[PDB]
Amino acid sequence: GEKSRMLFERTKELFPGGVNSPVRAAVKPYPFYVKRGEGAYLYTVDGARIVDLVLAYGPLILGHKHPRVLEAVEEALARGWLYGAPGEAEVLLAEKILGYVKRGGMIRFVNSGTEATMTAIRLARGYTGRDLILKFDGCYHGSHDAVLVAAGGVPTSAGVPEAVARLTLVTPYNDVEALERVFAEYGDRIAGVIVEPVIANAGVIPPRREFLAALQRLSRESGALLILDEVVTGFRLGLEGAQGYFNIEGDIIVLGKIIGGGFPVGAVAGSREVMSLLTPQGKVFNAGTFNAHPITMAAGLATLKALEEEPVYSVSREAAKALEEAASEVLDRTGLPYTINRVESMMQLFIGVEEVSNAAQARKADKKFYVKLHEEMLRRGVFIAPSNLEAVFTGLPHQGEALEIAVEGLRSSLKTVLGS
Amino acid sequence: GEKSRMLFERTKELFPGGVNSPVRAAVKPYPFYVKRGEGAYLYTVDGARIVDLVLAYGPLILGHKHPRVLEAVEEALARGWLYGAPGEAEVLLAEKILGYVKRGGMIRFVNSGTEATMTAIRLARGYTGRDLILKFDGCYHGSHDAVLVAAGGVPTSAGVPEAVARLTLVTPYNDVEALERVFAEYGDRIAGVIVEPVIANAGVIPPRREFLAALQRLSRESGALLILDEVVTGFRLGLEGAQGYFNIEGDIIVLGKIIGGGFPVGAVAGSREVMSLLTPQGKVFNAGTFNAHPITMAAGLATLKALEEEPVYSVSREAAKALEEAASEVLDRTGLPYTINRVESMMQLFIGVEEVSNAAQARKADKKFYVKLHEEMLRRGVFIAPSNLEAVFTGLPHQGEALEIAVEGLRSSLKTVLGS
Numbered sequence: 001g002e003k004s005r006m007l008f009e010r011t012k013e014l015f016p017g018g019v020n021s022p023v024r025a026a027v028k029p030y031p032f033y034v035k036r037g038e039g040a041y042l043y044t045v046d047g048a049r050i051v052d053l054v055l056a057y058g059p060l061i062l063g064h065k066h067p068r069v070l071e072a073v074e075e076a077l078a079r080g081w082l083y084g085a086p087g088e089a090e091v092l093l094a095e096k097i098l099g100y101v102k103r104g105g106m107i108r109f110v111n112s113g114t115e116a117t118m119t120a121i122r123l124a125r126g127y128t129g130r131d132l133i134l135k136f137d138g139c140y141h142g143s144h145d146a147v148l149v150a151a152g153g154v155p156t157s158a159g160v161p162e163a164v165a166r167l168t169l170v171t172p173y174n175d176v177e178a179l180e181r182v183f184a185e186y187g188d189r190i191a192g193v194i195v196e197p198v199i200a201n202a203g204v205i206p207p208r209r210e211f212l213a214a215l216q217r218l219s220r221e222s223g224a225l226l227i228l229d230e231v232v233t234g235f236r237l238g239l240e241g242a243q244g245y246f247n248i249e250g251d252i253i254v255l256g257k258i259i260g261g262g263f264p265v266g267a268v269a270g271s272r273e274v275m276s277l278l279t280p281q282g283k284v285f286n287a288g289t290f291n292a293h294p295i296t297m298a299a300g301l302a303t304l305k306a307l308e309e310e311p312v313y314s315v316s317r318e319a320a321k322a323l324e325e326a327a328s329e330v331l332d333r334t335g336l337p338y339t340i341n342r343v344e345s346m347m348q349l350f351i352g353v354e355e356v357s358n359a360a361q362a363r364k365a366d367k368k369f370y371v372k373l374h375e376e377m378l379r380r381g382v383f384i385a386p387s388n389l390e391a392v393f394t395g396l397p398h399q400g401e402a403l404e405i406a407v408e409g410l411r412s413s414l415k416t417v418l419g420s
Numbered sequence: 421g422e423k424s425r426m427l428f429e430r431t432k433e434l435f436p437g438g439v440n441s442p443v444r445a446a447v448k449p450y451p452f453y454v455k456r457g458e459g460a461y462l463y464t465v466d467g468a469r470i471v472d473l474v475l476a477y478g479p480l481i482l483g484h485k486h487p488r489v490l491e492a493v494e495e496a497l498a499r500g501w502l503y504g505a506p507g508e509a510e511v512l513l514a515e516k517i518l519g520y521v522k523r524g525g526m527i528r529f530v531n532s533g534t535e536a537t538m539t540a541i542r543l544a545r546g547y548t549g550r551d552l553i554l555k556f557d558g559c560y561h562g563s564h565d566a567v568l569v570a571a572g573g574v575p576t577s578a579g580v581p582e583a584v585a586r587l588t589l590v591t592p593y594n595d596v597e598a599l600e601r602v603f604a605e606y607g608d609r610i611a612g613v614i615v616e617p618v619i620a621n622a623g624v625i626p627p628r629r630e631f632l633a634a635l636q637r638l639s640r641e642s643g644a645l646l647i648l649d650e651v652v653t654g655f656r657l658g659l660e661g662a663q664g665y666f667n668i669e670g671d672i673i674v675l676g677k678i679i680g681g682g683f684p685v686g687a688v689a690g691s692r693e694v695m696s697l698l699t700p701q702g703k704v705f706n707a708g709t710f711n712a713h714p715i716t717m718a719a720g721l722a723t724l725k726a727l728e729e730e731p732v733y734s735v736s737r738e739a740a741k742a743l744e745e746a747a748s749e750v751l752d753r754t755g756l757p758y759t760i761n762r763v764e765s766m767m768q769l770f771i772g773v774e775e776v777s778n779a780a781q782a783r784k785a786d787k788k789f790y791v792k793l794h795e796e797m798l799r800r801g802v803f804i805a806p807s808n809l810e811a812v813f814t815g816l817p818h819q820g821e822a823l824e825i826a827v828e829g830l831r832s833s834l835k836t837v838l839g840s
């Protein structure tokens with residue numbers, strides 16, 4: 001790992017914490033640098049092939065450099081990559097996305113999930129004329145002030161004015177009693193309730209039907225808009241995402257990751273009535289030099305076509321199931337308390353706890369055990385998130401030999417850590 | 421324009437205002453759709469070649485599909501386009517950028533100018549422990565709450581809480597007296613003063629030396645960080661940007677557009693002391709799935725190399741000068757009040773006013789005349805921003821025949837509008 005070591009030294013003084021995104025710094029023993037990626041694999045700068053169970057944290061459900069997407073991007077590149085005026089790809093991608101998540105509605109393309117949720121929140125506030133936003137402990141919506149808050153709302157990041165943080169309410173995920181209580185107290189001032197249909201940034205945590213039911217009922221009865229943050233679930237839990245998977249409906253649907261094919265993206269979709277408030281039609285401001293970036297649009301379009309024509313969902317589901325069954329077989333024999341949460345192709349293991357239905361329980365999981373597992377798996381050529389609070393993602397290339405390596409790696413790594 | 425007309429009809433119900441960014445909707449008679457771009461030209465879906473004096477509003481100083489950048493991106497695409505872990509290109513681009521704008525400092529790559537200024541503001545607040553941010557009337561820093569404010573600070577966009585807007589102070593650009601007064605009253609609570617060294621979103625407005633002097637003095641004496649928003653000026657006003665061009669120094673330098681080569685990008689650069697507050701090193705949060713996107717990094721790196729090895733600055737400067745001289749020759753003969761502001765390769769014409777040193781004066785310019793000019797120029801195959809408040813940008817391909825067409829087009833269009 002000499003080459004990665006050298007790069008590690010160079011970035012120490014170039015980037016805060018040596019990385020451009022926090023999670024990247026936690027890789028053990030130290031972050032490896034990537035030369036390239038193809039299919040189910042990442043290849044380090046030193047030349048090592050690694051099975052990728054991170055998939056850039058969600059966007060790469062089709063794996064690395066998917067042939068169909070590569071070809072579409074090559075064609076798009078030949079046409080120039082930035083115009084500053086409308087292109088064809090954005091129209092086709094919008095029509096395809098809306099047909100699955102909000103028929104007859106509108107969409108606005110942005111450049112990150114952070115920009116997307118931020119825009120959704122401004123839209124909900126503009127539509128209702130209210131200030132307060134309700135989020136849940138453990139849910140992650142990006143790097144912007146309004147969502148960098150925790151229940152005393154107080155800032156979880158420095159540089160966030162307390163005056164801003166106090167406009168965001170926070171209650172536990174899957175806690176119906178707490179949800180009813182917050183609406184009883186502040187309901188008429190809540191502009192929107194934002195939530196991940198399946199938590200992906202506090203490990204993976206599935207929603208309780210009762211929680212989903214309350215979210216829809218309380219939002220509708222209070223006048224608050226239900227903002228489903230489907231940046232991760234969108235197009236991962238089937239073509240119709242969380243709405244179709246759980247049979248729920250959101251007022252505003254925030255999308256990202258997958259819809260960009262691997263390129264910078266974010267999107268806000270909703271009814272014509274709500275979406276029409278966005279500039280230049282309405283007074284809720286949103287603009288972006290890179291909005292509807294030609295390459296992002298071409299990549300996303302090709303990606304969704306693959307999701308419609310290739311067995312991505314079945315393959316990804318089976319891959320995650322195989323990993324879950326393998327880990328469960330080993331862990332069940334130990335008699336140690338543990339739980340694995342899986343929803344289709346997103347999952348995570350929690351050692352030390354028998355149930356994880358909220359962030360508080362996820363935080364009680366054995367972090368040391370997880371870190372050791374991450375390191376041992378990497379030593380065996382399999383890459384899983386370095387943080388127990390991140391998720392494990394599967395995709396199209398996780399089949400055949402690649403899957404065999406991942407499963408065998410997981411089995412052996414668990415045994416090694418359990419034997420230490 | 422049948423094909424653009426058809427697309428126009430399709431997007432009416434897909435996007436708010438029919439576009440993904442406000443300015444795009446103002447093109448006359450209606451927005452044309454782009455098939456591709458190459459060199460100094462955009463090509464409509466109907467097949468018409470148009471000289472591009474918009475350059476995607478700043479990023480394309482090298483023109484469309486620059487050969488060097490295209491090759492670098494092709495090589496990068498073959499390596500996969502998203503890893504979720506550190507790559508080589510981000511290291512090289514960071515080293516090159518910092519060598520020109522903040523030697524010995526640090527940088528953090530994000531996905532838009534909006535994310536960049538938003539991150540800079542959070543950093544300034546975190547570093548100083550203060551809440552207030554000072555901006556100037558007419559300056560544009562992106563699509564986020566803290567900068568969508570105007571002096572009563574009150575919201576300029578719906579959906580922005582008044583509690584948030586009041587944390588942003590606003591005074592006129594180039595107004596030293598007003599600047600001194602605001603610091604005398606609120607100085608000890610100002611975390612940072614953000615400003616465009618050259619305004620590009622209220623037409624083009626150059627800074628007064630006295631204003632630049634006051635900005636540096638007052639920030640230093642008050643403890644507020646001077647945030648130079650160089651999203652547009654960075655790498656356009658020479659390799660050293662505004663700091664080198666005007667011989668000024670900022671505490672935090674916000675970059676974007678050009679440094680991404682045409683791909684989604686944004687960046688915050690500053691001293692190690694300030695930048696070290698960013699996660700995972702410090703407590704000022706910033707994370708991004710697409711931060712340091714492999715393709716953006718490769719494109720930006722190749723772009724900066726071109727800026728160092730090709731006569732981009734001289735060619736672009738001469739192009740803008742030729743346009744300015746041509747327009748001035750025609751307008752001087754009319755005796756009508758007007759002014760053209762130009763700083764290297766960025767400029768704008770203001771009809772009806774003899775001086776434009778601030779946003780208030782820019783707003784007094786004859787908008788109807790400008791719109792007619794935009795439409796007439798487009799009819800003659802030359803594309804300038806549809807809004808008088810946007811800027812005209814020149815670049816490397818604006819030479820030879822392309823420049824002749826632009827200049828002749830400007831001359832003829834002015835005469836036609838002046839004769840109507």
Ligand SMILES: Cc1ncc(COP(=O)(O)O)c(CN)c1O
Pocket residue numbers: 111112113114115117140141142143196200201229230231232256265707708709710
């Ligand atoms: C649900 C959710 N929302 C928002 C984001 C942030 O997306 P981005 O990093 O592109 O700003 C993420 C990524 N962790 C996410 O999982």
Ligand SMILES: Cc1ncc(COP(=O)(O)O)c(CN)c1O
Pocket residue numbers: 287288289290531532533534535537560561562563616620621649650651652676685
């Ligand atoms: C000075 C400045 N700052 C910020 C921005 C916004 O950049 P972006 O559109 O990528 O969010 C712009 C683009 N108009 C700008 O000119």
